[PDB]
Design a protein around this ligand. Structure first.
Ligand SMILES: NCC[C@@H]1CCCC1(F)F
Length: 330
């Protein structure tokens, strides 16, 4: 089998991407944030505290003839931005882009933190990291990809995120028309539960490439590119007036600037992020200070190749017995 679904930016900045997902019988379509950095499929639901729902579409398990309570199971997750959610668990039929999994754990939120409530465009998350990170207790549950894997034509999914435009998540096949040149594959460590890999270096603009190993994760659920402070300082030093602002929470730059590109290495290959992809717009409405799309990972404990990086590439998440990542230009 295969599946193919379009993923759409939630706003004009590409702050996140939503993909329609069919849950239950008859189908209830919710728009989920596909997150290769986590491993829970959770949704706003008829069980979510009413004051914490503000415009989201909810899953109502009582209206699904295929829903079954997963008796005794609970879940609770916290993310790197400090947001969180928790609740109980149903199994149900879940389809993405024509690919159907029966018996998928659908984690129904009883509580969500304020940042989820305040984002009316995201109805939940669909985790695509390794199932070892799934938070369901006392019986850990498998991701949608892990459940689908054996049925897929090939044990892979691909992320093709757009810059200020829709893109595609495919399951089970590699669309050879969706990228240019060849795909360069690179080793993955699953020791932390992530799609963790080692970039071979970077360049700023037209500058010379610096060969240096940068361990990090491919994370569709993180907006920006988070890299070591040395690398990030070298980038922003090429932008007149850019500075790190503690009050804002990262590097800002004059909105009048033209940003240089940023290149990262994948083995001997190179992925070029155009400068415009690094512009996250005014820090507040009407400000002439703009927020940068490359930020330091110093406070995080891990480097994160988030959407800013991934949207410059066609990315293969290869879930074979030994997982690997592939990157192509597009
Ligand atoms: N997108 C899931 C959240 C990520 C995983 C590693 C660091 C982080 F919390 F930011």
């Amino acid at each position: 089998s295969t599946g193919s679904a379009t993923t759409t930016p939630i706003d004009s900045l590409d702050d996140a991407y939503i993909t329609p997902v069919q849950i239950g019988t008859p189908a209830q379509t919710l728009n989920l944030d596909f997150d290769t950095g986590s491993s829970d499929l959770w949704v706003f639901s008829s069980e979510t505290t009413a004051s914490e729902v503000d415009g989201q579409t909810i899953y109502t398990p009582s209206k699904s003839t295929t829903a079954k309570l997963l008796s005794g199971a609970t879940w609770s997750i916290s993310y790197g931005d400090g947001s969180s959610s928790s609740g109980d668990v149903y199994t149900d039929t879940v389809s993405v882009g024509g690919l159907t999994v029966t018996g998928q754990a659908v984690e129904s939120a009883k509580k969500v933190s304020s940042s989820f409530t305040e984002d009316s465009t995201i109805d939940g998350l669909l985790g695509l990291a390794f199932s070892t990170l799934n938070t369901v207790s006392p019986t850990q549950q498998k991701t949608f990809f892990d459940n689908a894997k054996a049925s897929l034509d090939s044990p892979v999914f691909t992320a093709d995120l757009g810059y200020h435009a829709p893109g595609t998540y495919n399951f089970g096949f590699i669309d050879t028309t969706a990228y240019t040149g060849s795909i360069t594959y690179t080793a993955v460590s699953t020791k932390q539960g992530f799609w963790e890999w080692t970039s071979t270096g970077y360049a700023v603009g037209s500058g010379t490439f610096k060969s240096t190993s940068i361990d990090g994760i491919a994370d569709t659920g993180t907006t920006l590119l988070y890299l070591p402070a040395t690398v990030v300082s070298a980038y922003w030093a090429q932008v007149s007036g850019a500075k790190s602002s503690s009050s804002v929470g990262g590097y800002v730059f004059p909105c009048s600037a033209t940003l240089p590109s940023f290149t990262f290495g994948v083995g001997s290959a190179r992925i070029v992020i155009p400068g415009d992809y690094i512009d996250f717009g005014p820090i507040s409405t009407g400000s002439s200070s703009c927020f940068g799309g490359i930020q330091s990972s110093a406070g995080i404990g891990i480097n994160i190749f988030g959407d800013v990086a991934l949207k410059a590439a066609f990315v293969v998440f290869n879930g074979a017995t030994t997982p690997t990542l592939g990157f192509a230009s597009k």
